[PDB]
Amino acid sequence: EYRNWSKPQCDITGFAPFSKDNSIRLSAGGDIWVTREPYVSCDPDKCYQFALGQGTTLNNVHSNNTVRDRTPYRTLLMNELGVPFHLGTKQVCIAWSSSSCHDGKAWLHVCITGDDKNATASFIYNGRLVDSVVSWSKEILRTQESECVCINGTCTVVMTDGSASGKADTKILFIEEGKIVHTSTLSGSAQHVEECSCYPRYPGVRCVCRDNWKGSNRPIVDINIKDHSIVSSYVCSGLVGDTPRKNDSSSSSHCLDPNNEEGGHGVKGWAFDDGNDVWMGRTISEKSRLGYETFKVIEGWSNPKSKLQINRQVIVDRGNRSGYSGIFSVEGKSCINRCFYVELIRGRKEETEVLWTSNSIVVFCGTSGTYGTGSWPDGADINLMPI
Ligand SMILES: *[C@@H]1O[C@H](CO)[C@@H](O[C@@H]2O[C@H](CO)[C@@H](O[C@@H]3O[C@H](CO[C@H]4O[C@H](CO)[C@@H](O)[C@H](O)[C@@H]4O)[C@@H](O)[C@H](O[C@H]4O[C@H](CO)[C@@H](O)[C@H](O)[C@@H]4O[C@H]4O[C@H](CO)[C@@H](O)[C@H](O)[C@@H]4O)[C@@H]3O)[C@H](O)[C@H]2NC(C)=O)[C@H](O)[C@H]1NC(C)=O
Ligand SMILES: *[C@@H]1O[C@H](CO)[C@@H](O[C@@H]2O[C@H](CO)[C@@H](O)[C@H](O)[C@H]2NC(C)=O)[C@H](O)[C@H]1NC(C)=O
Ligand SMILES: CC(=O)N[C@H]1[C@H]([C@H](O)[C@H](O)CO)O[C@H](S(=O)(=O)O)C[C@@H]1NC(=N)N
Ligand SMILES: *[C@@H]1O[C@H](CO)[C@@H](O)[C@H](O)[C@H]1NC(C)=O
Numbered sequence: 229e230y231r232n233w234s235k236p237q238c239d240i241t242g243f244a245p246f247s248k249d250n251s252i253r254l255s256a257g258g259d260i261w262v263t264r265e266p267y268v269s270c271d272p273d274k275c276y277q278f279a280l281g282q283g284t285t286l287n288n289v290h291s292n293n294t295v296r297d298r299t300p301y302r303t304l305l306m307n308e309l310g311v312p313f314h315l316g317t318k319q320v321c322i323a324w325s326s327s328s329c330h331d332g333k334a335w336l337h338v339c340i341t342g343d344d345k346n347a348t349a350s351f352i353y354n355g356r357l358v359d360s361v362v363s364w365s366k367e368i369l370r371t372q373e374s375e376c377v378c379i380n381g382t383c384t385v386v387m388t389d390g391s392a393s394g395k396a397d398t399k400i401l402f403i404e405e406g407k408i409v410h411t412s413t414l415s416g417s418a419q420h421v422e423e424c425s426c427y428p429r430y431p432g433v434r435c436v437c438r439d440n441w442k443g444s445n446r447p448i449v450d451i452n453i454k455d456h457s458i459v460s461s462y463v464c465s466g467l468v469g470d471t472p473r474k475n476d477s478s479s480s481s482h483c484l485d486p487n488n489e490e491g492g493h494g495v496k497g498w499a500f501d502d503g504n505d506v507w508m509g510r511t512i513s514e515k516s517r518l519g520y521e522t523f524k525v526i527e528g529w530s531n532p533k534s535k536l537q538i539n540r541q542v543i544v545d546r547g548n549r550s551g552y553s554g555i556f557s558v559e560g561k562s563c564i565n566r567c568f569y570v571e572l573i574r575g576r577k578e579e580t581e582v583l584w585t586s587n588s589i590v591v592f593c594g595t596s597g598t599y600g601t602g603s604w605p606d607g608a609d610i611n612l613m614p615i
């Protein structure tokens with residue numbers, strides 16, 4: 229009954245279209261939640277889309293100023309994948325930062341809300357509150373914004389507390405049926421870790437995260453579920469996956485250290501190893517959240533000098549807005565597959581035609597077959613939306 233993910237990673241040639249919800253286009257002629265920080269996680273049968281609501285629908289006086297990151301009204305929404313966040317969506321917990329996963333038996337939700345300097349993380353398993361932890365550094369306790377990972381009934385999640393522009397306090401929690409059974413401190417050479425996109429890599433858990441301090445290469449966190457040990461580093465690939473970052477011709481990376489290239493700030497992203505190669509996504513703009521592309525970097529997981537990409541796919545064309553992206557893993561008959569979602573942000577502050585800030589999603593899954601080309605942006609006409 230417990231998921232173990234003890235199958236090899238599927239062969240991957242690229243990614244094929246899987247889901248899109250068109251939520252902003254629908255918002256103009258229907259009651260749809262205002263959201264951000266979406267993600268996808270699946271129970272053994274089917275996938276669900278999650279996001280952080282703003283306690284309001286879009287066509288609604290309360291959508292004004294929803295660019296704001298943390299309010300007492302934000303809640304974690306959960307629908308089957310492809311059901312847009314309509315008024316019958318379940319708010320599974322109070323949260324302005326979250327992570328959820330299914331351990332094969334039940335859902336775990338990790339939900340952070342409350343004051344910036346004294347936030348509370350609730351742990352809800354199988355529909356009931358089982359544990360909670362207070363902010364340890366009094367400076368915006370925050371977590372993955374994408375699925376956690378469970379092996380043999382032990383779920384792990386990565387959480388950070390402290391500065392967004394300097395050394396912070398990152399901890400990796402081990403949760404069994406909703407109870408925190410152990411807490412490990414981040415260790416290794418990752419110098420700043422946020423918004424980890426984690427996946428099963430039996431017998432352990434591997435994460436590619438966001439360095440908001442000095443790195444435009446992405447940190448890696450490796451989690452041993454048995455002995456609770458932690459190691460960390462950076463995605464070697466000379467083509468780096470954060471935003472902002474330097475242009476392709478002049479960017480560099482490092483397997484152990486942040487590259488000190490437009491390292492400040494960032495955006496939630498993902499990557500995963502395939503042998504010594506690395507599959508990764510990133511925005512097409514090096515400076516802002518415009519466009520989205522995927523490709524494989526040959527020797528990109530082990531060689532910081534490789535900028536040799538192949539199998540590029542445009543997910544969102546450079547002229548349209550993207551945003552966060554994260555990984556989720558889906559068990560197939562013979563192998564574990566890798567999928568990702570792209571948050572498609574519309575509104576303030578970058579688009580001033582409206583007062584609100586929300587997103588739609590588009591989702592793609594690894595394939596061993598073939599695929600072609602396209603572009604699947606949000607598609608709403610911001611000039612014709614309710615203000
Ligand atoms: C982050 O979040 C945590 C958790 O919420 C929070 O900790 C909590 O703080 C509150 C507020 O201080 C604590 O509740 C208080 O408990 C004291 C008693 O505890 C103190 O004293 C005992 C020994 O006496 C010590 O063992 C203990 O360590 C503490 O030092 C109560 O006295 C408090 O009640 C009074 O204050 C309230 C407002 O705070 C009033 O509304 C209330 O009516 C009481 O006042 C009345 O009685 C007073 C005399 O007792 C008198 O002076 C007044 O004028 C009035 O007549 C309150 O219940 C709570 O226990 C903490 N929880 C934990 C788990 O530690 C952190 O503070 C927070 N941090 C930040 C930075 O936000
Ligand atoms: C949306 O919210 C903003 C507040 O963030 C409102 O704009 C401010 O409103 C007050 C009161 O009129 C003024 O003092 C400010 O000058 C306004 N502009 C700012 C802060 O830039 C705005 O009224 C709200 N809009 C709607 C339609 O409710
Ligand atoms: C807990 C929290 O507020 N996280 C915010 C992060 C954070 O400020 C940076 O990671 C620096 O720590 O910033 C992003 S962002 O799109 O503005 O990049 C938005 C996030 N908003 C929410 N998750 N509700
Ligand atoms: C990329 O960055 C470097 C350094 O700013 C600059 O010399 C170069 O012209 C930029 N643009 C390219 C290579 O298209």
Ligand SMILES: [Ca+2]
Binds near residue numbers: 439441443472494
């Ligand atoms: Ca960065």
